[PDB]
Amino acid sequence: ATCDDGRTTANAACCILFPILDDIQENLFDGAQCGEEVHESLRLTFHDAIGFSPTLGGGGADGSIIAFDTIETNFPANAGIDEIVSAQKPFVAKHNISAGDFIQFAGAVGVSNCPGGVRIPFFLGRPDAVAASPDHLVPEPFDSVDSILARMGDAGFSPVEVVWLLASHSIAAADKVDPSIPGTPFDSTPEVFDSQFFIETQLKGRLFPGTADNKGEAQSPLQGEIRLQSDHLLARDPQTACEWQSMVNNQPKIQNRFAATMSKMALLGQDKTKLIDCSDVIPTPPALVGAAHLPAGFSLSDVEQACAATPFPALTADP
């Protein structure tokens, strides 16, 4: 199909997304860059979608975190999310798509700006949200592995899928874990969707980048990087450590599994067969530039290897 401005897409219903794409690329993503608002928009896709429990309710990827922002943004696990919700709200008001569609569209567009990134499958047509998520549905960085895997499993994700989703932490920072050092990233390349997060979380912790007693924080290996306790444990626990290590210097697996599992997450509470595939509106991501490495001065002895079956791969260090 050909849209009014000459751009093409498989289904004509998708044409409405093109002015939305251009607006968010400039005005939410700072000119199609992989910066703060991409990272916050990607976090928003998960905090919207994981509000989904067969027992307790919540409609999953339904825009509830925007439609019922007064309730959801005050949940403790949603600390700091009000900023991206307030930034996205005027776009939803101006354009003619539902909040649930907008949150997943913005997350997919954002990720596509990141070198190494992927085009997350995107489907159009979610109805407006009809309930707020229950509290206590979003995993917290001081939750146990058992807790996190039980919560994610309740929403439909296996332990390997949790690891795959956490490739998101390769383009991510924290503002509320240690409020003395807001904006501190989880890996050394927060504007590159790469395996550095899976490498750097496996290094021996050395320091606290800000203060020393924050709930849900573990020691980091690097000044200028922050480590969550949940990531420390997921990299080391016998249920997940082998999958975690399998991501290291495995860019094709990171890409393939993150895209597939993000699509599953973006469809929680929805029926793909009732929606329209508009995946081809999402931009082509740039390539990695771009090689997996240990930080300068580090060696393989600094890796806390946690997979009994497979030795950690031999990486080189930056000079």
Ligand code: HEM
């Ligand atoms: C599995 C359990 C998870 C836990 C415990 C967790 C925890 C956290 C925490 C504590 C922060 C920092 C919030 C702040 O202080 O500002 C964060 C940020 C973030 N999370 Fe995760 N997360 C999890 C899973 C995921 C998933 C599945 C995604 C996929 C979309 C995701 C995407 C992000 C992104 C992109 C950020 C960066 C936000 C920014 O830069 O402001 N998280 N997460």
Ligand SMILES: C[As](C)(=O)[O-]
């Ligand atoms: C059950 As919970 C996700 O608030 O630790």
Ligand SMILES: [Ca+2]
């Ligand atoms: Ca929701």
Ligand SMILES: [Ca+2]
């Ligand atoms: Ca990265």
Ligand SMILES: [Mn+2]
């Ligand atoms: Mn942030």
Ligand SMILES: [Zn+2]
């Ligand atoms: Zn910006």
Ligand SMILES: [Zn+2]
């Ligand atoms: Zn519009």
Ligand SMILES: [Zn+2]
């Ligand atoms: Zn509407």
Ligand SMILES: [Zn+2]
């Ligand atoms: Zn709770």
Ligand SMILES: [Zn+2]
């Ligand atoms: Zn709790």
Ligand SMILES: [Zn+2]
């Ligand atoms: Zn908890």
Ligand SMILES: [Zn+2]
């Ligand atoms: Zn365990």
Ligand SMILES: [Zn+2]
């Ligand atoms: Zn480096």
